[PDB]
Design a protein around this nucleic acid. Sequence first.
DNA 1: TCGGATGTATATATCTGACACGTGCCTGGAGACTAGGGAGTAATCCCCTTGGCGGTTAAAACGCGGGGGACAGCGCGTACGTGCGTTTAAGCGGTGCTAGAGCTGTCTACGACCAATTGAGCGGCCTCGGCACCGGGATTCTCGA
DNA 2: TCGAGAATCCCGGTGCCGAGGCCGCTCAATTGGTCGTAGACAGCTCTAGCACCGCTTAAACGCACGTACGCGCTGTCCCCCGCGTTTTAACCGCCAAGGGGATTACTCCCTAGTCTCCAGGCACGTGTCAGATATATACATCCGA
Lengths: 93, 94, 97, 96, 78, 78, 107, 107
Amino acid sequence: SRKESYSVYVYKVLKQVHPDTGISSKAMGIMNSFVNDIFERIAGEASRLAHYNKRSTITSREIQTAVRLLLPGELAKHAVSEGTKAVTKYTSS
Amino acid sequence: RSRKESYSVYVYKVLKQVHPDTGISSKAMGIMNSFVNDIFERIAGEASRLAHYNKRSTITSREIQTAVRLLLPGELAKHAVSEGTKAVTKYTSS
Amino acid sequence: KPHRYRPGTVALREIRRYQKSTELLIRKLPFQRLVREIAQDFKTDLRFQSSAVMALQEACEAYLVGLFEDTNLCAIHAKRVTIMPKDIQLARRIRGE
Amino acid sequence: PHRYRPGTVALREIRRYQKSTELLIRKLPFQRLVREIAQDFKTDLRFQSSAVMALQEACEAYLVGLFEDTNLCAIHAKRVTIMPKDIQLARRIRGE
Amino acid sequence: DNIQGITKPAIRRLARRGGVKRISGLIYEETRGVLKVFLENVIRDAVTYTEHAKRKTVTAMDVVYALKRQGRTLYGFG
Amino acid sequence: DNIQGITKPAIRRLARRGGVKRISGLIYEETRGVLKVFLENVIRDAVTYTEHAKRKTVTAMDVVYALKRQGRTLYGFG
Amino acid sequence: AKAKTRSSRAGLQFPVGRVHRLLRKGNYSERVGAGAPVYLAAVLEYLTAEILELAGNAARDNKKTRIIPRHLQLAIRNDEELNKLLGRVTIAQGGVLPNIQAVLLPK
Amino acid sequence: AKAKTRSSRAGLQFPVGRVHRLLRKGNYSERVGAGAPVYLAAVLEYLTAEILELAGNAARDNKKTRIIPRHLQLAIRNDEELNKLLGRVTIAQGGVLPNIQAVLLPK
DNA sequence: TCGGATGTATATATCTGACACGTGCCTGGAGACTAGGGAGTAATCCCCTTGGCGGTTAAAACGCGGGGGACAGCGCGTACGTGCGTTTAAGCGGTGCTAGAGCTGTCTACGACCAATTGAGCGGCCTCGGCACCGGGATTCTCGA
DNA sequence: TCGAGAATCCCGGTGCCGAGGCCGCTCAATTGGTCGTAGACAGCTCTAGCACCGCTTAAACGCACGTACGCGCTGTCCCCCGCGTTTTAACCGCCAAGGGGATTACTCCCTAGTCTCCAGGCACGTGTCAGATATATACATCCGA
């Protein structure tokens, strides 16, 4: 029953931002559920944008528009900058 | 050069079926078309979510039946379920 | 001058007439100018379809009449007949906005 | 004759219960209520413990939000106590 | 007979958490009615979700789903 | 400026349609403020929608999408 | 041999072929069952027939033989169940139903 | 074969490959671009980092070195953008940010 | 009002079960190559959206008389807060049993793919009938005495 | 209650443009077949939910007492309403134009698909320490003496 979830990644990002703070099991479940919900929301918005623009693919532009629609102002700006940086550095390899 | 798609002929047919003589203006036509599209999108999305919920890949009669029972109020849901089951069994009888 | 209408009667006739009808209350040109002015600060010199402004104004009117309705209910709950800004801000707070 | 004036104990309870995060509604009566409500929907249904806990958590959060909104209505109507008309108007404005 | 099981002190505690000082005696019936209506809706959604899956146990996952479909999502359960 | 485009009589008519008898003085400033914030939100969503499609004209159907995203559907435009 | 349309096969009026194509090309799922479009078309037809019967009744009340958005809006709100189903939509040319509070009435 | 993970290629911590698999299997569109999972992983990582930094601060000033759901809800509600984003979200086992209206307070 | 007593924040011992980490394994992610259709790019048209001018008139703006309403102050009798003794049953810990969720194997009916086709449905035109608009006047309200 | 003044439903007549029907054309839904596989079904396991049984004590119940205040009443002052008069710019109609929305074609090249390989992540197991409890002490504070 190899259930899979964003378990080690949340812990890794926490240990990256905070060195010794730990996460309880309930907090782990809450964080995993939040990650799943936000991912599903962004993916649904991107899918709606792509299908309803007579397009057939989800690219970086679709998700950028979805994250500009969903997140509030400052969060949208920072998330867009982070995503652009990640995509550029990935393509540079 | 234009091939716009709409439910105009079908909603007009059902209107003439229920009410022998009643007109529908262009605004009401667009409104009914938008309502049909919205209800279809809602039910299809719910059925898609229900198909993803049991690692299944088929939208079947049960999926839309449960979606209708979900997104419709009591009497409306019961009547819609009865009508859908009747239509499905009539089709399969052919 | 005799036969001057008491306050409330003209208001009641106006409210009945505007509930009975379904015409356009917000003037078209001021609203279109307003929406152009408020959208020109998101993207330079972008254009608007006439049906786009019409749909935007329809949604505007529907939302505003719903708010008012709710704020009139709230003002009535406070043993008052006239709406006050406290009523709208509380109604917005309850509605989650 | 020591005795706390009315209101102070209420304030202490309000602060203590906002600071805490435990589950307020007693578990077993809520479980019995949920089972009765589900009994008329299906015969001899079964419930997971986590399902009942999730139901209780969601229901308590909804009640806390509703009571906060109705307290806002009460303090808006120039009083500090809440009566059913307050929660009725809160529900109506919320769009129940 | 059982809806009364959500008794007066529990309602008072929930209200205190909500942030209200004084409570009238006529609000308990109304809040019990609100509880019954909301739980009827959510439990009906969960029950039909289980009925679709040919199951007899209302799992927590379907309950939280049904809450999400209701428009009031919930975390901490998957 | 251009926020005075909607006027005192226009807001009075909107309120009368909404179902209120008497109207205060600051009520106009408050309703203009809430109208400005709501239209700003909707226009931002619609402008992003029309920006994604590499277009410089806002069609009504975008506006319909922007309204739908904010949980307020609109009928009669597509 | 023979071109019996599937909508007539199901005894309906709504296009089962069009809803089948929309379901398949709407990426709702990998595959769509045979009875799924029929069930969806039947549900849509029943809902449309109900709302149109109510709208036509409202129009006949207003001594008009043309259904207009006002009649549709009134028919939707006056019926409780369809009001609940469409409680978050704002119909164009709506004109919310007349409603005056008891306290506001003169006396 | 070099065996260089794509998550480390983009300098991220979230699994870009798992996100790509979820996007492909999840019925969103018939095909998914190469940069879409990278962008999604970056967005998820930034949001999780923000919420976890806020929750860690709320734990640190609470004299505890372990995040509990109460700290997560306090961090979510105290911030403005996160509260707007998670508006309808109910946090399990969390409480409510303490507040008392001015009127209810004693003189 | 200072002051007695109540509740709450703070230090210290302790002991526990959940969290952090190590380990084996396998399934899913990655490297590499193909090929095929999505779309980026390039022209092209004509739709309509922006812009401007004249009038003309409805509606906005301004100002005044004032009566109804918001709001403050005050009195009262009741409903609710607070506390204590009693009763209740919730929560604790085991314990047993099995209905039912989860997993595995199969084989078959069911839905995707594809060539041909034909008729259902859409674009465009035309016409007349339902509806918008104006004039008369009978009814339905409203206000003052 | 009994008068006049205004506001509105109702009716008749005329015009007008939008809905409904008709026509031709086409492209997409239907027939028919093939084939790969999704899941329906049967069988098995075994985690977990349910019922019972008893003990302990937190929590709910009931009641007495007081008092804070929700509500009713009244006075004041003010501030929107109704209405008359002035102003302005919305709207309708008409005229020009060109920005770019929508369309089609072509070629590049991005990604689905498959094969192969391997290591990142998961289930499981174990140490250990963060924090939950309990006792004692000192500060915040509340309500009277």
